[PDB]
Amino acid sequence: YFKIYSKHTPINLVRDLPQGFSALEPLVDLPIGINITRFQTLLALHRS
Amino acid sequence: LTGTGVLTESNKKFLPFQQFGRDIADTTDAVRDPQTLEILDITPCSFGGV
Ligand SMILES: *[C@@H]1O[C@H](CO)[C@@H](O)[C@H](O)[C@H]1NC(C)=O
Ligand SMILES: *[C@@H]1O[C@H](CO)[C@@H](O)[C@H](O)[C@H]1NC(C)=O
Numbered sequence: 001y002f003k004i005y006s007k008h009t010p011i012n013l014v015r016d017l018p019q020g021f022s023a024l025e026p027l028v029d030l031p032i033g034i035n036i037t038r039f040q041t042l043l044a045l046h047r048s
Numbered sequence: 049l050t051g052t053g054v055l056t057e058s059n060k061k062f063l064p065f066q067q068f069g070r071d072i073a074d075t076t077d078a079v080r081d082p083q084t085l086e087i088l089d090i091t092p093c094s095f096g097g098v
Contacts, residue, residue, distance in 0.1 A: 025063065025065060026065045
């Protein structure tokens, strides 16, 4: 089971992480049953 | 989940993910019923010493 816990917070700090407390609610309990050892995030380009 | 008790209305604001509730003993004290998704409080039936 691949658990995704998520939280959205309105922040106004410019550069670093804000200092505070925010508990992440469980979002998706996912039934995959596969081996995971390495990951990579996906970004989006801007074209002009 | 098996047990004995009186099922009553409750005022506990359960979060969407949350289904049941547990006391200190870890016995279920509130439950979310399937099909109707409502939150029923479980209060143990009255007992005492005769
Ligand atoms: C997952 O894969 C790694 C190597 O890619 C292996 O060492 C590990 O034992 C695997 N785990 C499971 C649960 O299959
Ligand atoms: C059946 O249960 C699902 C969730 O368990 C619920 O969304 C649905 O409304 C229920 N249907 C009826 C007819 O009770």
